[PDB]
PDB file of C-alpha atoms in Angstrom:
ATOM      1  CA  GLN A   1       0.098  -0.549  -0.074  1.00 26.66           C
ATOM      2  CA  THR A   2       2.801   2.173  -1.141  1.00 26.69           C
ATOM      3  CA  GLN A   3       3.208   2.074  -4.417  1.00 24.81           C
ATOM      4  CA  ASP A   4       1.383   5.116  -4.663  1.00 22.45           C
ATOM      5  CA  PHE A   5       3.126   7.312  -2.267  1.00 20.30           C
ATOM      6  CA  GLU A   6       6.650   6.948  -4.168  1.00 20.03           C
ATOM      7  CA  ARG A   7       5.430   7.825  -7.493  1.00 19.58           C
ATOM      8  CA  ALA A   8       3.604  10.666  -6.208  1.00 20.76           C
ATOM      9  CA  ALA A   9       6.895  12.046  -4.333  1.00 19.26           C
ATOM     10  CA  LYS A  10       8.043  11.958  -7.752  1.00 18.70           C
ATOM     11  CA  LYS A  11       6.653  13.489  -9.890  1.00 17.76           C
ATOM     12  CA  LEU A  12       7.341  17.046  -7.548  1.00 20.83           C
ATOM     13  CA  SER A  13       8.972  18.990  -8.677  1.00 22.25           C
ATOM     14  CA  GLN A  14      12.723  19.726  -6.777  1.00 21.96           C
ATOM     15  CA  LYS A  15      11.453  23.682  -6.087  1.00 23.12           C
ATOM     16  CA  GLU A  16       8.651  21.762  -4.552  1.00 20.05           C
ATOM     17  CA  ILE A  17      10.514  19.154  -2.748  1.00 18.53           C
ATOM     18  CA  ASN A  18      12.299  22.012  -1.238  1.00 17.79           C
ATOM     19  CA  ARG A  19       9.531  23.852   0.278  1.00 19.12           C
ATOM     20  CA  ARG A  20       7.391  21.393   1.578  1.00 21.81           C
ATOM     21  CA  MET A  21      10.739  20.525   3.193  1.00 19.79           C
ATOM     22  CA  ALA A  22      11.215  23.822   4.275  1.00 18.16           C
ATOM     23  CA  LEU A  23       8.033  24.037   5.876  1.00 17.70           C
ATOM     24  CA  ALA A  24       8.589  20.623   8.101  1.00 19.51           C
ATOM     25  CA  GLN A  25      12.194  21.508   8.550  1.00 21.29           C
ATOM     26  CA  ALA A  26      10.603  25.080  10.064  1.00 21.29           C
ATOM     27  CA  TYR A  27       7.931  22.393  11.913  1.00 23.20           C
ATOM     28  CA  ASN A  28      10.607  20.512  13.720  1.00 25.36           C
ATOM     29  CA  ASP A  29      12.250  23.633  14.746  1.00 24.25           C
ATOM     30  CA  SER A  30       9.380  25.051  17.033  1.00 24.13           C
ATOM     31  CA  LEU A  31       8.092  21.565  17.549  1.00 25.64           C
ATOM     32  CA  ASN A  32       6.233  21.906  21.117  1.00 29.82           C
ATOM     33  CA  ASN A  33       5.776  17.861  22.732  1.00 31.30           C
ATOM     34  CA  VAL A  34       2.943  18.719  24.371  1.00 32.17           C
ATOM     35  CA  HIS A  35       0.821  17.251  21.617  1.00 31.87           C
ATOM     36  CA  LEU A  36       2.294  14.125  23.322  1.00 33.38           C
ATOM     37  CA  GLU A  37      -0.603  11.387  23.253  1.00 35.82           C
ATOM     38  CA  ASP A  38      -0.385   7.979  23.608  1.00 36.06           C
ATOM     39  CA  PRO A  39      -2.492   6.586  20.254  1.00 36.96           C
ATOM     40  CA  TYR A  40      -3.650   2.904  22.494  1.00 40.90           C
ATOM     41  CA  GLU A  41      -5.205   4.403  25.677  1.00 39.78           C
ATOM     42  CA  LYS A  42      -8.497   1.744  25.417  1.00 36.73           C
ATOM     43  CA  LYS A  43     -10.868   5.039  25.808  1.00 34.67           C
ATOM     44  CA  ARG A  44      -9.329   8.150  24.661  1.00 36.15           C
ATOM     45  CA  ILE A  45     -11.384  10.830  22.998  1.00 37.59           C
ATOM     46  CA  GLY A  46      -9.897  14.562  14.101  1.00 35.51           C
ATOM     47  CA  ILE A  47      -8.236  14.524  11.136  1.00 35.94           C
ATOM     48  CA  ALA A  48      -4.115  15.471  10.789  1.00 37.46           C
ATOM     49  CA  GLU A  49      -3.523  18.741   9.548  1.00 40.77           C
ATOM     50  CA  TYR A  50       0.114  18.944  11.067  1.00 38.86           C
ATOM     51  CA  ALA A  51       2.210  17.530   8.397  1.00 37.87           C
ATOM     52  CA  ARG A  52       0.235  18.199   4.713  1.00 36.97           C
ATOM     53  CA  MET A  53       3.750  19.800   3.911  1.00 33.07           C
ATOM     54  CA  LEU A  54       5.270  16.462   3.991  1.00 31.52           C
ATOM     55  CA  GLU A  55       1.923  14.420   2.410  1.00 31.03           C
ATOM     56  CA  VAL A  56       1.513  12.579  -0.879  1.00 28.46           C
ATOM     57  CA  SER A  57      -1.304  10.862  -1.736  1.00 28.21           C
ATOM     58  CA  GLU A  58      -2.977  10.898   1.602  1.00 32.20           C
ATOM     59  CA  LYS A  59       0.422   9.550   3.668  1.00 29.54           C
ATOM     60  CA  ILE A  60       3.883  10.766   4.930  1.00 31.99           C
ATOM     61  CA  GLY A  61       6.559   7.894   4.032  1.00 29.31           C
ATOM     62  CA  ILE A  62       6.612   4.550   4.181  1.00 27.69           C
ATOM     63  CA  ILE A  63       8.120   2.424   7.148  1.00 29.30           C
ATOM     64  CA  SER A  64      10.264  -0.323   6.300  1.00 26.70           C
ATOM     65  CA  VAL A  65      11.455  -2.765   8.682  1.00 25.76           C
ATOM     66  CA  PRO A  66      13.739  -6.085   6.928  1.00 22.75           C
ATOM     67  CA  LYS A  67      13.636  -8.031   9.408  1.00 21.01           C
ATOM     68  CA  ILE A  68       9.974  -8.757  10.085  1.00 24.45           C
ATOM     69  CA  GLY A  69       8.932  -8.337   6.412  1.00 22.19           C
ATOM     70  CA  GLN A  70       7.289  -5.222   7.001  1.00 24.28           C
ATOM     71  CA  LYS A  71       6.701  -2.087   4.273  1.00 24.82           C
ATOM     72  CA  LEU A  72       4.108   0.278   5.922  1.00 28.74           C
ATOM     73  CA  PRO A  73       3.076   3.653   4.889  1.00 28.75           C
ATOM     74  CA  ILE A  74       2.875   6.163   7.477  1.00 30.62           C
ATOM     75  CA  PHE A  75      -0.280   8.512   7.739  1.00 30.59           C
ATOM     76  CA  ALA A  76      -0.104  11.903   9.616  1.00 29.52           C
ATOM     77  CA  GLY A  77      -0.737  11.736  13.411  1.00 28.38           C
ATOM     78  CA  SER A  78      -2.068   8.061  15.289  1.00 29.02           C
ATOM     79  CA  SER A  79      -5.847   8.239  14.991  1.00 28.36           C
ATOM     80  CA  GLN A  80      -7.473   4.533  15.321  1.00 29.40           C
ATOM     81  CA  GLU A  81      -8.473   4.974  11.859  1.00 29.72           C
ATOM     82  CA  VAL A  82      -5.256   5.222  10.136  1.00 29.66           C
ATOM     83  CA  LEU A  83      -3.767   2.797  12.794  1.00 32.71           C
ATOM     84  CA  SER A  84      -6.016   0.061  11.151  1.00 29.40           C
ATOM     85  CA  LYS A  85      -4.599   0.962   7.931  1.00 29.47           C
ATOM     86  CA  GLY A  86      -1.200   1.384   7.899  1.00 30.67           C
ATOM     87  CA  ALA A  87       1.897   3.166  10.412  1.00 30.39           C
ATOM     88  CA  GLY A  88       0.969   6.995  12.164  1.00 33.33           C
ATOM     89  CA  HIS A  89       3.524   9.123  12.951  1.00 32.74           C
ATOM     90  CA  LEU A  90       3.702  10.578  17.020  1.00 30.05           C
ATOM     91  CA  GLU A  91       1.802  13.629  16.788  1.00 30.57           C
ATOM     92  CA  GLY A  92       4.306  16.476  19.290  1.00 30.96           C
ATOM     93  CA  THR A  93       7.645  14.659  18.067  1.00 32.52           C
ATOM     94  CA  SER A  94       9.943  15.637  14.653  1.00 34.80           C
ATOM     95  CA  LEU A  95       8.335  14.758  11.357  1.00 38.19           C
ATOM     96  CA  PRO A  96      10.232  12.138   9.716  1.00 37.38           C
ATOM     97  CA  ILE A  97      13.139  14.633   8.109  1.00 35.27           C
ATOM     98  CA  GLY A  98      16.348  13.515  10.110  1.00 33.28           C
ATOM     99  CA  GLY A  99      18.512  16.011  10.522  1.00 35.33           C
ATOM    100  CA  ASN A 100      20.258  17.351  14.134  1.00 39.06           C
ATOM    101  CA  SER A 101      18.654  16.424  17.485  1.00 37.95           C
ATOM    102  CA  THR A 102      15.373  15.301  16.034  1.00 37.57           C
ATOM    103  CA  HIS A 103      13.739  12.288  17.073  1.00 40.97           C
ATOM    104  CA  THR A 104      10.413  11.352  15.379  1.00 40.15           C
ATOM    105  CA  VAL A 105       8.582   8.458  16.267  1.00 41.01           C
ATOM    106  CA  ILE A 106       6.238   6.052  13.997  1.00 39.40           C
ATOM    107  CA  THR A 107       3.790   3.497  15.584  1.00 39.11           C
ATOM    108  CA  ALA A 108       1.357   0.557  14.345  1.00 38.41           C
ATOM    109  CA  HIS A 109      -0.493  -1.431  16.423  1.00 40.20           C
ATOM    110  CA  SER A 110       0.757  -4.899  17.718  1.00 40.44           C
ATOM    111  CA  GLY A 111      -2.757  -6.340  18.784  1.00 36.97           C
ATOM    112  CA  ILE A 112      -4.564  -6.523  16.343  1.00 36.10           C
ATOM    113  CA  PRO A 113      -6.019 -10.204  14.747  1.00 30.60           C
ATOM    114  CA  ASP A 114      -5.496 -10.492  10.655  1.00 29.42           C
ATOM    115  CA  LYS A 115      -3.016  -7.550  10.569  1.00 26.99           C
ATOM    116  CA  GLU A 116       0.150  -7.895  10.378  1.00 28.66           C
ATOM    117  CA  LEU A 117       1.910  -4.237  11.332  1.00 29.58           C
ATOM    118  CA  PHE A 118       3.982  -4.266  14.453  1.00 27.04           C
ATOM    119  CA  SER A 119       2.807  -7.670  15.704  1.00 25.21           C
ATOM    120  CA  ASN A 120       5.974  -8.700  15.369  1.00 27.45           C
ATOM    121  CA  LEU A 121       8.280  -5.391  16.696  1.00 26.52           C
ATOM    122  CA  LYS A 122       9.589  -7.469  19.394  1.00 24.30           C
ATOM    123  CA  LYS A 123      11.608  -9.479  17.371  1.00 23.22           C
ATOM    124  CA  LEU A 124      14.041  -6.191  16.513  1.00 27.49           C
ATOM    125  CA  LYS A 125      17.196  -6.622  18.362  1.00 29.52           C
ATOM    126  CA  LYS A 126      19.821  -3.598  18.865  1.00 29.92           C
ATOM    127  CA  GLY A 127      21.967  -3.594  15.419  1.00 31.88           C
ATOM    128  CA  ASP A 128      18.993  -4.195  12.928  1.00 34.40           C
ATOM    129  CA  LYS A 129      17.649  -1.850  10.900  1.00 34.19           C
ATOM    130  CA  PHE A 130      14.872   0.060   9.736  1.00 36.93           C
ATOM    131  CA  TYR A 131      14.125   2.562   6.997  1.00 36.70           C
ATOM    132  CA  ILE A 132      11.967   5.683   6.285  1.00 32.54           C
ATOM    133  CA  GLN A 133      11.511   6.989   2.906  1.00 33.39           C
ATOM    134  CA  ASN A 134       9.675  10.374   2.912  1.00 32.71           C
ATOM    135  CA  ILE A 135       8.835  12.905  -0.448  1.00 33.88           C
ATOM    136  CA  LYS A 136      12.736  13.370  -0.905  1.00 33.62           C
ATOM    137  CA  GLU A 137      14.874  11.206   0.378  1.00 34.70           C
ATOM    138  CA  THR A 138      15.283   6.880   2.324  1.00 33.45           C
ATOM    139  CA  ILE A 139      16.673   7.801   5.448  1.00 32.97           C
ATOM    140  CA  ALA A 140      18.542   5.109   7.304  1.00 34.14           C
ATOM    141  CA  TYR A 141      18.286   3.365  11.661  1.00 31.57           C
ATOM    142  CA  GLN A 142      20.151   1.200  12.827  1.00 33.56           C
ATOM    143  CA  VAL A 143      18.708  -0.019  15.961  1.00 32.82           C
ATOM    144  CA  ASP A 144      20.377   0.650  20.086  1.00 34.61           C
ATOM    145  CA  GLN A 145      18.140   0.553  22.722  1.00 36.52           C
ATOM    146  CA  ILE A 146      15.198  -1.687  23.007  1.00 35.99           C
ATOM    147  CA  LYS A 147      12.752  -0.195  26.396  1.00 36.74           C
ATOM    148  CA  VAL A 148       9.388  -1.321  27.939  1.00 37.50           C
ATOM    149  CA  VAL A 149       7.750   1.807  29.344  1.00 34.50           C
ATOM    150  CA  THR A 150       4.986   2.152  30.882  1.00 33.91           C
ATOM    151  CA  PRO A 151       1.962   4.777  29.079  1.00 35.92           C
ATOM    152  CA  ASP A 152       2.530   7.430  30.427  1.00 34.08           C
ATOM    153  CA  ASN A 153       6.349   8.306  30.694  1.00 34.44           C
ATOM    154  CA  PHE A 154       7.296   9.785  27.457  1.00 35.74           C
ATOM    155  CA  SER A 155      11.026  10.255  28.225  1.00 38.13           C
ATOM    156  CA  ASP A 156      11.984   7.402  25.959  1.00 38.82           C
ATOM    157  CA  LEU A 157      10.265   9.861  22.923  1.00 39.58           C
ATOM    158  CA  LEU A 158      11.598  13.298  23.173  1.00 41.22           C
ATOM    159  CA  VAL A 159      14.020  15.441  21.065  1.00 43.20           C
ATOM    160  CA  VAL A 160      18.158  13.868  22.682  1.00 40.13           C
ATOM    161  CA  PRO A 161      19.677  17.587  21.257  1.00 41.33           C
ATOM    162  CA  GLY A 162      22.788  16.740  19.158  1.00 42.40           C
ATOM    163  CA  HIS A 163      20.660  12.655  17.952  1.00 43.89           C
ATOM    164  CA  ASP A 164      18.896  12.667  15.143  1.00 43.31           C
ATOM    165  CA  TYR A 165      17.029   9.178  16.281  1.00 42.75           C
ATOM    166  CA  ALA A 166      13.503   7.410  15.374  1.00 39.45           C
ATOM    167  CA  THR A 167      11.506   4.617  17.787  1.00 41.13           C
ATOM    168  CA  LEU A 168       8.997   2.751  16.412  1.00 44.66           C
ATOM    169  CA  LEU A 169       6.489   2.517  18.689  1.00 41.11           C
ATOM    170  CA  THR A 170       4.035  -0.644  19.442  1.00 38.61           C
ATOM    171  CA  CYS A 171       1.751  -2.303  22.482  1.00 34.28           C
ATOM    172  CA  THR A 172       3.213  -4.728  24.490  1.00 34.92           C
ATOM    173  CA  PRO A 173       2.215  -7.560  26.057  1.00 33.66           C
ATOM    174  CA  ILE A 174       0.088  -8.958  22.463  1.00 35.53           C
ATOM    175  CA  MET A 175      -3.557  -8.151  23.870  1.00 32.44           C
ATOM    176  CA  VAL A 176      -2.223  -7.007  27.049  1.00 30.99           C
ATOM    177  CA  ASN A 177      -1.761  -3.458  26.404  1.00 31.64           C
ATOM    178  CA  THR A 178      -0.716  -2.156  29.765  1.00 33.23           C
ATOM    179  CA  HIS A 179       3.089  -1.014  28.490  1.00 30.65           C
ATOM    180  CA  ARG A 180       4.773   0.853  25.168  1.00 32.80           C
ATOM    181  CA  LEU A 181       7.443  -1.235  23.081  1.00 32.97           C
ATOM    182  CA  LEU A 182       9.896   1.585  21.790  1.00 32.66           C
ATOM    183  CA  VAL A 183      12.015   0.460  19.535  1.00 32.83           C
ATOM    184  CA  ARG A 184      14.318   3.509  18.813  1.00 34.36           C
ATOM    185  CA  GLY A 185      18.157   3.672  16.378  1.00 32.74           C
ATOM    186  CA  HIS A 186      20.366   5.924  15.646  1.00 33.02           C
ATOM    187  CA  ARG A 187      20.834   7.812  11.969  1.00 30.60           C
ATOM    188  CA  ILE A 188      23.144   5.937   9.659  1.00 34.78           C
ATOM    189  CA  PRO A 189      23.899   5.849   5.992  1.00 33.67           C
ATOM    190  CA  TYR A 190      21.572   4.326   4.015  1.00 32.87           C
ATOM    191  CA  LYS A 191      23.046   1.794   1.377  1.00 34.63           C
ATOM    192  CA  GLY A 192      12.507  -1.246  31.296  1.00 34.46           C
ATOM    193  CA  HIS A 193      15.630  -2.056  29.011  1.00 34.65           C
ATOM    194  CA  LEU A 194      15.535  -5.683  27.146  1.00 33.81           C
TER     195      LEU A 194
END
């Protein structure tokens, strides 16, 4: 469900990619993490507008996790509608374009029967890799920390100065969902603690 994004991204001119990426950079520089909310709170209380500059074909990117054979569309926000059809981006975290002092968080469900999504995220280990494609390019991350945290602990999702991080976020234990699994990687060239 990702070929449409690729096709549409390739049709943008370089000036338009630059304009959009500028808006995304400006958004990241003004990021306020007050938007941080747990997507998997059962009794949690709209359409996401904050990442429109990165959107083509309704999507802001593609998340590839080769070890578990996933290549999923990324949609803005983390609404139930989004999480039923692919991966979401956690509003309040950096948009997935990389850069110094950025930390983007991409999330998908582990406990929807009959949809793989991030059901097997817990198979990831330090040294494994994942990739995010946005309208400009594909950026790569190498897993360097795996943590299981409570749903009200956002500490490990915040921007770390001087680093370019990405975390893949899901619920755990499978079908129980009392906790959150956070698989963090650091930027590499594209070619509690567990």
